[PDB]
Amino acid sequence: QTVTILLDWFGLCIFTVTGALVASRKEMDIAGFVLLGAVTGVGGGTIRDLVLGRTPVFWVEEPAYVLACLGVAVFTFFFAHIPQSRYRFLLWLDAVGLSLFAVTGAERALQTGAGPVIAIAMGVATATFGGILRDLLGGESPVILRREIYITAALLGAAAFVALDAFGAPRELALGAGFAAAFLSRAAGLVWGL
Amino acid sequence: QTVTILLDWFGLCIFTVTGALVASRKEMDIAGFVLLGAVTGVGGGTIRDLVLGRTPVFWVEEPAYVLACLGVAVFTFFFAHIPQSRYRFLLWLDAVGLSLFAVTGAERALQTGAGPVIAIAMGVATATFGGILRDLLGGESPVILRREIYITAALLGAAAFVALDAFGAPRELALGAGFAAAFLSRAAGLVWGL
Amino acid sequence: QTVTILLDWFGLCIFTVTGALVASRKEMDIAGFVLLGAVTGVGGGTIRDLVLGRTPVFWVEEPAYVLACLGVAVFTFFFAHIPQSRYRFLLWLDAVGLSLFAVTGAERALQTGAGPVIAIAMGVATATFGGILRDLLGGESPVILRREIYITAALLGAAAFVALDAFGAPRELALGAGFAAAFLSRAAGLVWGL
């Protein structure tokens, strides 16, 4: 499987754009885009690997991950002017990255040797903490404190993944159904809320 | 000794109720209770084990720790309506967990092979950071910024523990005197302050 | 080389004074000085060693590092009354520690076996996160959100270090030119801004 590696690259990239565009909201310099983007894109996975015991961390093991951020962030620096509202993009991109990181996070937490509960916990953790770091450093109130599905989207994503992978389904559809049960569920609330 | 394991279970549980009830203050969903409760209950110990070098972390080594949170948090979800003011419960429970985590934290920091100063530092760290994570993610000002004993209760708890364990006292009374010198001292300020 | 060890001791010390004096701004107790000072002085390096994979962390490996903080913080407790404005001292000391931690951070990130990009990333990281922890726990808005060079000073410091160490210059002048390109650049903005 190389699908999930792609989902991780897209989670890192998308979250990078979230942090970079957040840096656009705070009128920060380009280095702000690169740093904050790196912290948000990499952060969920880095905390995941820290608690799970992966050493060295994925972005220090392969620097490309941070470079992508450095790419994307810089890209966003030029294209932050284009989309308004940017915060909407924040919400939607956060939803996507949330889904992908929930599912893939649960996956790599499960292939370690950990239990299903740990898998779901890490699924929720990569996405949520990924958002958490950017929203903390950014200095604005985090998306978690608003209603109503943020944590439950990642929760049902990871839980659906683990549940369907328990019966020995093909893993690809576990990834798809996790991503769906997360992204769709979150999107419903981002549609009724906005 | 299995006493300190029980003190750790109670620190994790109590802090879990702190985070969950905080989630009640922010009108968050149940997943908020579970997540925030897990982060606050586990967080102090997880940071402790991270800096001390314990791999894998205690809750990934044994998932039961997070499950307890998942239990307690859910429990709190149903029983958050009952107690008002809830913030008082926050303060007192935080005091208890502070004491227990100061003492036990100093203990497990000392059995690693580290110095007495490191022991006290980790004693203060488990409790304080345990509160820190919940108060940061919650989006309200942390208990540390208010007067006057929060850090000194854990400090004198851990310091009393290490001091009495230096002379080779029985460890149980070091645990008791640590817990006392912490909880009583904090309670005096929570009595004169409220 | 023992120069960089001295630069690290000064980064830890100076950042300790930043956190301690911040504790002076929040009218916190002495334990606040010691704790917050330890968290800010040690924090950048501790996160650096965590992601890089250094176990045990530098201050648990040698407790002296925290003791210095305990020293300095206590010292600041007595000498916090003397200098006003204290926040100016915060800015300048933060600049110094920023420079030294950028350069030395890049250095020790490079001697691990990591790439140049990782080196620069860790250079920026030790300084920035060192400030981040104190500004988060302190409860005030972080220095990063203000204009304009904070991240770019550490960025050009670390980048100049790595760039001059790539051609095989003498490392001492790479340290000097990193420190210069960081501290001077930041100082220009702290001179035009104030």
Side-chain angles (χ1 to χ4, degrees), chain A residues 1-80 82-84 86-87 89-171 173-193, chain B residues 1-80 82-84 86-87 89-171 173-193, chain C residues 1-80 82-84 86-87 89-171 173-193:
Chain A
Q1 290 168 104
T2 49
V3 282
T4 173
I5 289 85
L6 302 167
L7 294 186
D8 283 343
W9 277 103
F10 258 69
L12 165 138
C13 283
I14 284 172
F15 271 112
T16 300
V17 204
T18 63
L21 86 90
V22 160
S24 322
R25 313 198 47 249
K26 291 316 184 65
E27 276 177 22
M28 301 187 59
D29 44 343
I30 172 68
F33 288 72
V34 185
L35 180 142
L36 202 50
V39 175
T40 174
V42 157
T46 207
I47 302 189
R48 158 194 80 195
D49 295 326
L50 282 185
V51 294
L52 275 192
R54 293 293 163 176
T55 293
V57 66
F58 69 98
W59 61 282
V60 167
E61 171 66 16
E62 254 167 39
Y65 286 97
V66 77
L67 289 169
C69 303
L70 164 64
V72 178
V74 162
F75 164 84
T76 310
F77 182 35
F78 285 5
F79 288 75
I82 296 301
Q84 295 210 2
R86 337 174 202 82
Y87 191 80
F89 276 24
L90 260 181
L91 300 173
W92 295 102
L93 281 186
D94 201 330
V96 181
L98 168 91
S99 308
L100 306 175
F101 270 178
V103 186
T104 61
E107 162 200 30
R108 309 206 326 110
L110 236 185
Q111 72 167 297
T112 293
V117 45
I118 298 180
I120 302 178
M122 290 281 82
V124 182
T126 57
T128 45
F129 282 89
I132 284 188
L133 297 192
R134 87 168 185 265
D135 297 314
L136 274 183
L137 310 187
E140 293 287 351
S141 57
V143 198
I144 316 181
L145 280 40
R146 101 172 308 167
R147 336 203 196 283
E148 57 185 303
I149 38 205
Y150 198 80
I151 316 96
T152 75
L155 185 56
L156 287 29
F161 165 79
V162 176
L164 299 190
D165 194 25
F167 299 155
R171 255 187 42 79
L173 68 70
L175 300 185
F179 169 69
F183 184 49
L184 267 55
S185 45
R186 178 71 197 288
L190 276 176
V191 154
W192 304 137
Chain B
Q1 290 168 104
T2 49
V3 282
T4 173
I5 289 85
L6 302 167
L7 294 186
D8 283 343
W9 277 103
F10 258 69
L12 165 138
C13 283
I14 284 172
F15 271 112
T16 300
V17 204
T18 63
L21 86 90
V22 160
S24 322
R25 313 198 47 249
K26 291 316 184 65
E27 276 177 22
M28 301 187 59
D29 44 343
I30 172 68
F33 288 71
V34 185
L35 180 142
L36 202 50
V39 175
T40 174
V42 157
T46 207
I47 302 189
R48 158 194 80 195
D49 295 326
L50 282 185
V51 294
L52 275 192
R54 293 293 163 176
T55 293
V57 66
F58 69 98
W59 61 282
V60 167
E61 171 66 16
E62 254 167 39
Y65 286 97
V66 77
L67 289 169
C69 303
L70 164 64
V72 178
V74 162
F75 164 84
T76 310
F77 182 35
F78 285 5
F79 288 75
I82 296 301
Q84 295 210 2
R86 337 174 202 82
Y87 191 80
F89 276 24
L90 260 181
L91 300 173
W92 295 102
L93 281 186
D94 201 330
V96 181
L98 168 91
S99 308
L100 306 175
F101 270 178
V103 186
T104 61
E107 162 200 30
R108 309 206 326 110
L110 236 185
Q111 72 167 297
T112 293
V117 45
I118 298 180
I120 302 178
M122 290 281 82
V124 182
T126 57
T128 45
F129 282 89
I132 284 188
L133 297 192
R134 87 168 185 265
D135 297 314
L136 274 183
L137 310 187
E140 293 287 351
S141 57
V143 198
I144 316 181
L145 280 40
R146 101 172 308 167
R147 336 203 196 283
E148 57 185 303
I149 38 205
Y150 198 80
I151 316 96
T152 75
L155 185 56
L156 287 29
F161 165 79
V162 176
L164 299 190
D165 194 25
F167 299 155
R171 255 187 42 79
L173 68 70
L175 300 185
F179 169 69
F183 184 49
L184 267 55
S185 45
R186 178 71 197 288
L190 276 176
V191 154
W192 304 137
Chain C
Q1 290 168 104
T2 49
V3 282
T4 173
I5 289 85
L6 302 167
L7 294 186
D8 283 343
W9 277 103
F10 258 69
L12 165 138
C13 283
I14 284 172
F15 271 112
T16 300
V17 204
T18 63
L21 86 90
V22 160
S24 322
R25 313 198 47 249
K26 291 316 184 65
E27 276 177 22
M28 301 187 59
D29 44 343
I30 172 68
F33 288 72
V34 185
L35 180 142
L36 202 50
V39 175
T40 174
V42 157
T46 207
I47 302 189
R48 158 194 80 195
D49 295 326
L50 282 185
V51 294
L52 275 192
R54 293 293 163 176
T55 293
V57 66
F58 69 98
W59 61 282
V60 167
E61 171 66 16
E62 254 167 39
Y65 286 97
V66 77
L67 289 169
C69 303
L70 164 64
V72 178
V74 162
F75 164 84
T76 310
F77 182 35
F78 285 5
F79 288 75
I82 296 301
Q84 295 210 2
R86 337 174 202 82
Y87 191 80
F89 276 24
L90 260 181
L91 300 173
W92 295 102
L93 281 186
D94 201 330
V96 181
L98 168 91
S99 308
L100 306 175
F101 270 178
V103 186
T104 61
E107 162 200 30
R108 309 206 326 110
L110 236 185
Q111 72 167 297
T112 293
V117 45
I118 298 180
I120 302 178
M122 290 281 82
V124 182
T126 57
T128 45
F129 282 89
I132 284 188
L133 297 192
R134 87 168 185 265
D135 297 314
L136 274 183
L137 310 187
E140 293 287 351
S141 57
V143 198
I144 316 181
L145 280 40
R146 101 172 308 167
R147 336 203 196 283
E148 57 185 303
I149 38 205
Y150 198 80
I151 316 96
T152 75
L155 185 56
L156 287 29
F161 165 79
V162 176
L164 299 190
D165 194 25
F167 299 155
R171 255 187 42 79
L173 68 70
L175 300 185
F179 169 69
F183 184 49
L184 267 55
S185 45
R186 178 71 197 288
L190 276 176
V191 154
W192 304 137

